[PDB]
Amino acid sequence: FKFEFKFE
Amino acid sequence: FKFEFKFE
Amino acid sequence: FKFEFKFE
Amino acid sequence: FKFEFKFE
Amino acid sequence: FKFEFKFE
Amino acid sequence: FKFEFKFE
Amino acid sequence: FKFEFKFE
Amino acid sequence: FKFEFKFE
Amino acid sequence: FKFEFKFE
Amino acid sequence: FKFEFKFE
Amino acid sequence: FKFEFKFE
Amino acid sequence: FKFEFKFE
Amino acid sequence: FKFEFKFE
Amino acid sequence: FKFEFKFE
Amino acid sequence: FKFEFKFE
Amino acid sequence: FKFEFKFE
Amino acid sequence: FKFEFKFE
Amino acid sequence: FKFEFKFE
Amino acid sequence: FKFEFKFE
Amino acid sequence: FKFEFKFE
Amino acid sequence: FKFEFKFE
Amino acid sequence: FKFEFKFE
Amino acid sequence: FKFEFKFE
Amino acid sequence: FKFEFKFE
Amino acid sequence: FKFEFKFE
Amino acid sequence: FKFEFKFE
Amino acid sequence: FKFEFKFE
Amino acid sequence: FKFEFKFE
Amino acid sequence: FKFEFKFE
Amino acid sequence: FKFEFKFE
Amino acid sequence: FKFEFKFE
Amino acid sequence: FKFEFKFE
Amino acid sequence: FKFEFKFE
Amino acid sequence: FKFEFKFE
Amino acid sequence: FKFEFKFE
Amino acid sequence: FKFEFKFE
Amino acid sequence: FKFEFKFE
Amino acid sequence: FKFEFKFE
Amino acid sequence: FKFEFKFE
Amino acid sequence: FKFEFKFE
Amino acid sequence: FKFEFKFE
Amino acid sequence: FKFEFKFE
Amino acid sequence: FKFEFKFE
Amino acid sequence: FKFEFKFE
Amino acid sequence: FKFEFKFE
Amino acid sequence: FKFEFKFE
Amino acid sequence: FKFEFKFE
Amino acid sequence: FKFEFKFE
Amino acid sequence: FKFEFKFE
Amino acid sequence: FKFEFKFE
Amino acid sequence: FKFEFKFE
Amino acid sequence: FKFEFKFE
Amino acid sequence: FKFEFKFE
Amino acid sequence: FKFEFKFE
Amino acid sequence: FKFEFKFE
Amino acid sequence: FKFEFKFE
Amino acid sequence: FKFEFKFE
Amino acid sequence: FKFEFKFE
Amino acid sequence: FKFEFKFE
Amino acid sequence: FKFEFKFE
Amino acid sequence: FKFEFKFE
Amino acid sequence: FKFEFKFE
Amino acid sequence: FKFEFKFE
Amino acid sequence: FKFEFKFE
């Protein structure tokens, strides 16, 4: 139930 | 589930 | 059951 | 399943 | 069973 | 299967 | 078994 | 098989 | 759950 | 219940 | 809970 | 109730 | 509680 | 109530 | 309480 | 009420 | 859908 | 929705 | 959505 | 929302 | 959102 | 928010 | 947020 | 906040 | 925050 | 605060 | 804080 | 304060 | 504080 | 004060 | 204070 | 004052 | 900019 | 199969 | 820049 | 299935 | 740079 | 499901 | 560089 | 849920 | 290099 | 919850 | 290389 | 809580 | 290689 | 509390 | 390889 | 309290 | 110079 | 879907 | 030089 | 979604 | 040389 | 979201 | 050579 | 968030 | 060779 | 946060 | 070979 | 925080 | 081979 | 804090 | 083989 | 604090 957030 | 939000 | 979201 | 939404 | 969506 | 929807 | 759809 | 539908 | 916020 | 924060 | 703050 | 802080 | 401060 | 301090 | 200061 | 000091 | 405009 | 603007 | 501008 | 700016 | 600028 | 700057 | 600069 | 500097 | 510099 | 210095 | 230098 | 020195 | 040196 | 010396 | 030397 | 000497 | 598709 | 979309 | 999609 | 989004 | 999304 | 965000 | 997010 | 942050 | 965070 | 920090 | 932190 | 430090 | 620390 | 040290 | 320490 | 030492 | 476009 | 362009 | 663009 | 560009 | 950009 | 770039 | 950048 | 770069 | 960098 | 680098 | 670095 | 490195 | 390092 | 290393 | 080290 | 190592 993951939630990855790349900013860059 | 799993999610990607790659900004850039 | 992935969901990729590239913005960029 | 799997999904791509590449904006750009 | 992929579904690519390029916008750009 | 697999699908492409490249807009642009 | 691909299905490409270019719009542009 | 494989298919192209390039609009433009 | 789990979360990623990778800046860079 | 993790919360990763990469800066770099 | 648990937290990551990896700088670098 | 951990709090990791990597600098490096 | 518990804390990590790993420099390097 | 620990406090780890790695320098290295 | 308790403390760690591991240098190296 | 310990105080560990590793140098190495 | 494509457009082009040349002035010269 | 492509757009082209030549100026020479 | 794409745009281009050439001056020369 | 692509943008292109040629100058030669 | 992408931009590019070429001068030459 | 990509940015590109060519100079030759 | 990304930037790039090429001179040559 | 990525930055790129090519010089050849 | 990342920087890179390539000379060649 | 990453820094990269290529020289070839 | 990280630095790297490659010469070759 | 990481430092890297490649030479090949 | 870390350093590394690779020659090859 | 870590030090690393690779030679291959 | 640590040192290491690998030759091979 | 650790010292390491690998030779393979 | 509607569309519709059938195969087989 | 079957397929359709809308735009603008 | 709306959209809508159906399959199957 | 079904799918839609909005932008700007 | 708003957004909205629906599936299923 | 449902999803939305904002930027800038 | 604000942000906002909602799901479900 | 809900989520937001600020930068710079 | 400020920051702010909210969840739930 | 709530979270913030400062750097440099 | 200052810092500041708040939680809760 | 609250937390801060200094370096160099 | 100074330091300073505060908590609570 | 409060804490500080010096090195080298 | 001096040192100094304060607490409380 | 207070604490210090010397080496080498 | 001045320009406008309308579609739909 | 309106449009604008200005020059000079 | 001067430029402006408007959309939506 | 406004835009601007300046040169010279 | 001189440059400026404005968005939003 | 303002921007600047200088050269020379 | 000389360079400057401003943002926000 | 100011910036600088010098070369030569 | 010579280099300098400034930030903040 | 000043910086320097010398080579040669 | 020769090198120097300055920070702060 | 000064630095030096010599080789050869 | 020969090497030297200076710090502080 | 001086340093030396010899090889060969 | 031969080796030497000096410190302080 | 001198050092020596011999091999072979």
CB–CB of AI6 and AH4 under 8 A? yes
Cα-based distances in Å from AU7 to I5, R5, R8 = 35, 69, 74
Residues of chain R with Cβ-Cβ distance to Q6 below 8 Å are: 4, 6-7
Return d(Cα AT3, Cα BC6) in angstroms, integer.
37
Return d(Cα T6, Cα AX6) in angstroms, integer.
16
Instruction: Using a CB–CB cutoff of 8 Å, tell me whether E8 touches chain S.
Output: yes
Return d(Cα AF5, Cα AE5) in angstroms, integer.
5
Handedness of CA AZ2, S1, B3, B6 (dihedral sign): negative
Cα-based distances in Å from R8 to E7, T6, AX4 = 30, 12, 20
What's the maximum distance between 2 C-alpha atoms anywhere in chain C?
22
Residues of chain BE with Cβ-Cβ distance to BD1 below 8 Å are: 7
Residue with tokens 């990791």: L4
Which structure tokens are listed for H8? 């433009």
Residues of chain W with Cβ-Cβ distance to V5 below 8 Å are: 3-6
Which DSSP letter does residue AR3 get? B
Say which experimental method was used.
Answer: cryo-EM
Strand AN4-6, strand Q5-6: pairing: unpaired
CB–CB of AC5 and AD5 under 8 A? yes
Q: CA-based angle AR6:AS4:AT2, to the nearest 5?
A: 145
Q: How many residues does chain X have?
A: 8
Return d(Cα V3, Cα T5) in angstroms, integer.
11
Radius of gyration of chain F (CA): 7
Return d(Cα AL3, Cα AN6) in angstroms, integer.
20
Residues 6 or more apart whose Cβ sits within 8 Å of residue R7: Q6, Q7, Q8, S5, S6, S7, S8
Residues of chain BG with Cβ-Cβ distance to BF4 below 8 Å are: 4-7
Which DSSP letter does residue AQ7 get? -
Z3 → chain Y, closest CA residue:
Y3
Identify the three-state secondary structure at position S3: coil
BF6 DSSP β-pair partners:
BE2, BG4
Residues of chain BK with Cβ-Cβ distance to BJ4 below 8 Å are: 4-7
Are BC5 and BB5 contacting, i.e. CB atoms less than 8 angstroms apart?
A: yes
Which structure tokens are listed for AC1? 């504080």
Instruction: Using a CB–CB cutoff of 8 Å, tell me whether S7 touches chain E.
Output: no
CB-side neighbour CA atoms (13 Å) of AU5: 11
CB–CB of AM7 and AL5 under 8 A? no
Return d(Cα R4, Cα AT5) in angstroms, integer.
64
- Resolution of the determined structure in angstroms stands at 3.8
Question: Which residue, among AQ2, N6, X8, has the nearest Cα to L5 in the 3D structure?
Answer: N6
Which structure tokens are listed for AR7? 């370096």
Return d(Cα N6, Cα P8) in angstroms, integer.
11
Question: Three-state SS across C1-8?
Answer: CCCCCEEC
User: What is the four-CA torsion angle of R5, BB2, U5, Q8, rounded to 10 degrees?
Assistant: 30
Out of T1, T2, T5, closest to residue U5 by CB: T5
Which DSSP letter does residue AD5 get? E
- DSSP secondary structure letters along Q1-8: ----EE--
Chains that touch R (3 or more CB pairs under 8 A): Q, S
Chains that touch BL (3 or more CB pairs under 8 A): AF, BK
Q: Burial letters for AX1-8: b for 16+ Cβ neighbours within 10 Å, e otherwise?
A: bebebeee
Question: Which residue, among J5, B5, P1, has the nearest Cα to AQ7 in the 3D structure?
Answer: J5
Q: Cα distance from U2 to chain T (closest Cα, Å)?
A: 5
- DSSP secondary structure letters along AZ1-8: --EEEE--
Are BE3 and BD4 contacting, i.e. CB atoms less than 8 angstroms apart?
A: no
Return d(Cα AQ4, Cα AO5) in angstroms, integer.
14
Return d(Cα BE7, Cα AI2) in angstroms, integer.
41
Are L2 and M6 contacting, i.e. CB atoms less than 8 angstroms apart?
A: no
Question: Which residue, among F2, D3, BL5, AH2, has the nearest Cα to B2 in the 3D structure?
Answer: D3
Question: Which residue, among BK7, AC6, A6, has the nearest Cα to C8 in the 3D structure?
Answer: A6
Return d(Cα C3, Cα D1) in angstroms, integer.
9
Return d(Cα J6, Cα AC6) in angstroms, integer.
27
N7 → chain AC, closest CA residue:
AC1
CB-side neighbour CA atoms (13 Å) of AL7: 17
Strand AA4-6, strand Z4-6: pairing: parallel
Neighbours of U6 (CB within 10 A): 17
Element containing residue AT6 per DSSP (H, E): strand AT4-6
